[PDB]
Design a protein around this ligand. Sequence first.
Ligand SMILES: [Mg+2]
Ligand SMILES: [Mg+2]
Ligand SMILES: [Mg+2]
Ligand SMILES: [Mg+2]
Lengths: 685, 702
Amino acid sequence: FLIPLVALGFAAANFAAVVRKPEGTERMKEISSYIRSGADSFLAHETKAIFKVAIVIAILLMIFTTWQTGVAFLLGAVMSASAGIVGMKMATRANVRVAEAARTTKKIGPALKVAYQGGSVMGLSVGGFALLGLVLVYLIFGKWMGQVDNLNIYTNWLGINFVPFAMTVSGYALGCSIIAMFDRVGGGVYTKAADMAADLVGKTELNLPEDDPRNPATIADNVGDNVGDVAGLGADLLESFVGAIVSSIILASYMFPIYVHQVPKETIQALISYPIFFALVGLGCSMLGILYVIDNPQRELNISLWTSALLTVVLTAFLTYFYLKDLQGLDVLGFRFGAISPWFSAIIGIFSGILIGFWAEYYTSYRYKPTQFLGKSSIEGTGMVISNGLSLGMKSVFPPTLTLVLGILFADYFAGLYGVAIAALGMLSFVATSVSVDSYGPIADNAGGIDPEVRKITDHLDAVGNTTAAIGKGFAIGSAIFAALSLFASYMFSQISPSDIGKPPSLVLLLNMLDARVIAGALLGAAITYYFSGYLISAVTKAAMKMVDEIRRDYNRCIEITSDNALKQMGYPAFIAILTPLVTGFLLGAEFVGGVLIGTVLSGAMLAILTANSGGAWDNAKKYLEAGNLEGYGKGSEPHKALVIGDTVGDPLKDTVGPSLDILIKIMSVVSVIAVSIFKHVHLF
Amino acid sequence: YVAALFFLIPLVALGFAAANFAAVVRKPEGTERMKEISSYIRSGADSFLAHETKAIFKVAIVIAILLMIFTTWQTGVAFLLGAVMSASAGIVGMKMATRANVRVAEAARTTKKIGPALKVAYQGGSVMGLSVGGFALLGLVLVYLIFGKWMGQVDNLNIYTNWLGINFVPFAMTVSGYALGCSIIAMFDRVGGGVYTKAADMAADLVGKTELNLPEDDPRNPATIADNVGDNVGDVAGLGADLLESFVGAIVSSIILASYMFPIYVQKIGENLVHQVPKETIQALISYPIFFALVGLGCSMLGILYVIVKKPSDNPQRELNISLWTSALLTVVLTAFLTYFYLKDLQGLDVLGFRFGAISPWFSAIIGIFSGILIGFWAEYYTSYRYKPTQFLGKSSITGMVISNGLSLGMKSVFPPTLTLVLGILFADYFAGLYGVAIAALGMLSFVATSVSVDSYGPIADNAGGISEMCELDPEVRKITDHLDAVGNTTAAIGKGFAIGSAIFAALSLFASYMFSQISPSDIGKPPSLVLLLNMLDARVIAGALLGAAITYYFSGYLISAVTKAAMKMDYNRCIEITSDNALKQMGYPAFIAILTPLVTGFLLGAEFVGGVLIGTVLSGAMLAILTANSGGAWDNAKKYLEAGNLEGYGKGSEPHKALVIGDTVGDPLKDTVGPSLDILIKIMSVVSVIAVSIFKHVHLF
Ligand SMILES: [Mg+2]
Ligand SMILES: [Mg+2]
Ligand SMILES: [Mg+2]
Ligand SMILES: [Mg+2]
């Protein structure tokens, strides 16, 4: 209860504590000033865009559905934006202090503590704002208006029949989705255009030094390392977390009228509240793990993760047993082992998540065989390097997907679709620690950008941050896959109609693949996924060229130009993501859109895994060859040329395309779930 | 009866192919070193063919015996027949191209008959296409005449249950085995051949980047002879194998849909299920795809011969379009006549969903035909720099940016053909339900004879380009054949698009067939609408979709890994044979995985999971195929433009030219092995799933 406020205050306390850390060096202070100025300008531009789009969409939701939906949309927008702003400011401020600690104390410990404190500020802001928004929505709308009390399908002034509370939580999830969409897409385009331009100025005719303070592109690359790995990745994790919670709530809410009432109101109310309490326990357990951690940084991060996971396991076992022991109609909704069944699913998801990270690591890291084969092959041709990286990513897609399939099967066997959503929530129970670790990465990147012994210590922490960022990217992709699957489940429950309640519940819960509509929608969704990825790449290249032209021709000016180009190019993919469900449905019904959702989820998950793993393998092979474990091949060799080309191709892919894809899948699912009440029946063909 | 005339049409196609073979035999072939080179290529290719043919004969005999064990022996016999017919078509086309390669260059150079040499090369492609179509339809008609009519498998038309719990229609299972045979042979051909051809092209570029400096597509490299052997193996044989595989899949799926529609439509009156559709109507709907295919073959032959003797279009691509358009329109009109007669003899139109009666499947057919044409157009529009696409590729060439833009261009090109195909699906459904969806599938490849003709023309032009580069009589001598090679690359992309569109329609019909095979006598008592149900909500189905998409990407990646390993590894003829044998050995594994995945996934999780696996495989394979084909074609077409130097006089020596060559060599394995292997994967997985459903829907562990 009010645990999110504790997270917000504890995040603010770590902000105040780290501000009291000396900034030391003057050149480093100036670099942090440049990064802060550029990041704040980018914030101003994106916040103007987000304000306009969010107000428009909130008014639209208020028009077509109940006003509570639009209010929750705005609330989610505000909460996610606040979390992102607080975390990004923390990260921009903490890098120089981390460097100062590492330099003065000649030790990695104080620097590690300050960097992890900044990461914790970001993660705590995420969790606290998200869960505080959830609690405010529940307290204001569910109880004061009695939407949960009557728990009846409402018909608004446009003749749209729908569940008010489900539509409101759908709008709140849509707000999280819109914030994550703008953050990840625009920011990632910025981040990879900036890193690409930083590498390009090294290779231009003017030979402006790469990773140079006078280079505007190095400052843009640092700002992007912050914006991408913090705002976009944390936004993705919060979007998947909120999607899972909202999916559980929607599943219970629509199971109430479907099972006829075969399930009492008390059971439905408890199943709606269970993810909320389960989410709160995850936040508390995550903070406990963080507090314990605050010579091996990876060991400390792993300890934080495992403590958070195990504490969640035990406390949620107790909560789930004590709270769901007193409900009726558990078997009808799929609780095989009774009240213990959802908790089981949750822990399963937890394990799935951790395992997924390993697989990402197993393919992305150069310590293991996959990236060693890539580095060894690099002696034989740039094209062969590109082919081997593509093959490695395509091979890497399989093991995490197999893990996800096994987790889905186990969660289903335990507790139906409700426990599938609970397993998603279990995977995201330690999302606070996940966001903290992930936002650690870019602080280390910036510190690296900022004695040879202190340099090597900063390099050590930067490499640890890179590895953790790759692991977090894999984790985010897996969590987004679970969230999209649960959102599809919620959409298909939303397929319910007043005429359908008389029909068998199994007959209602029905999407035949044999339908040409379903098959064609799956095809179209997969095609739109690939077309989205292609236009992402084109936009990134265009933005990089525009920045290079401006540089040839004011660091804030160049950042503003890049931000404006990214925002202008973001409209078309955002338009596609928003309009595909609406247009496809108002033309063909809801079965076509369900097929679209299935195909989009499949294609986006697969491409995201592929791109993330390939880029991670390429970057780690670069580091492998630089450290020289491939004996007899020094810097400047043909393998280095091949790896540089491979990284320039892959880095933008792994850091914007795949995350954009999983944001795409989740937002398309959310928009379909929201619009179903209209466009199931208002369809042209 | 007139059926004798229909049976004679494939025989006429075979005879005309033999006549064109006699035409190519009259090759002067003045050049001696190039003739010896082609003889060496023929010897190596035939040795590889003998080795792979022995291995695939072993595997095919094993699989046929397995079919005889688990299901009817007619299934294995039809599988063996399809193996023989497809192998014969591939061999005939290969011999035709190998004989024609030197002849085209000889005519164009010595006799200055560049145009006539082009015409004879397209005639060789037509020989391959006629062999493909004639052998496929001859096998189909022999199967139908022997088993459906003589043995009374259609006459009794009753579901039989053998041991192991397999319930099935004997004739439907026989045609399923014949389609599975075409799929297995096409798999062995394409996977290994594509690995070999792209390893050979990559190895030629490696000799460019070895201690020597003799690159790929390069006259100075004699290692390119292995690349030429590949230009035949796969770039000729595999396109016909894939198109025949999709063609047979569409026809067999239509036949299965019609055959299982007979027991499905039953109405419970007085505790007795009355067959809602008569036997005569079902038999007519089973025979109709065969007559439509025969009419399509006849129209294709008429159009091809008419174009050869009517007008020498100065644009070879325009001439190919003229041939395609004539064949398409003739097929449309004659199928109008056929379907009007069937509508005159049909009465169960509303119960089966025929809005316009038998004309509605005809509509669907036309839809598919036009759809295919449009798809091809789109392919060109994105792969060729005639419009802004691939022009921006050259602008980017003006290296990492180039690679990124090529990837983006391929992914952009994915969307329009898929949108056109979705519109075609919607229209075919609206006309005539799933039966007309299958009819549109068959319509798209109704002119598959002309399609294979054009596509197999392509690599003959590629070989002529290599020979012209070797001759070095003039850069214009090289460029005349490079023009034809670029046309061939565009046609290969068009053929891949046709194959994937037909595969998508056929896979839709195969989902229908899978759920039809789910029928049991209890399901016959149960409502057909309730039976026809594969819920997406189901965790099994959704997880299966995820797994199928993952297997699609992992298959592509392991293909790339095997090709790269072969390139890393490499008597020069002995070395080529060793590389080819290693490629076949590594081809063995993914095929085994593809065959075993449906069986294992089902015996673990039911039939819903396997249906989901099929869904995911269809989606991912189709999308990747479109992507790879378009991207590779765009890269190669931009190469041609920069080589001619119309890009501001940069010339060969420009560093961006080297970067673009490297990018094109990267793209080649994708466009020439990944996507077509994926669509064959999709259809073979669907076929084996539909076969195994009868057991493993109810004999499942979890
Ligand atoms: Mg070549
Ligand atoms: Mg060549
Ligand atoms: Mg060639
Ligand atoms: Mg090639």
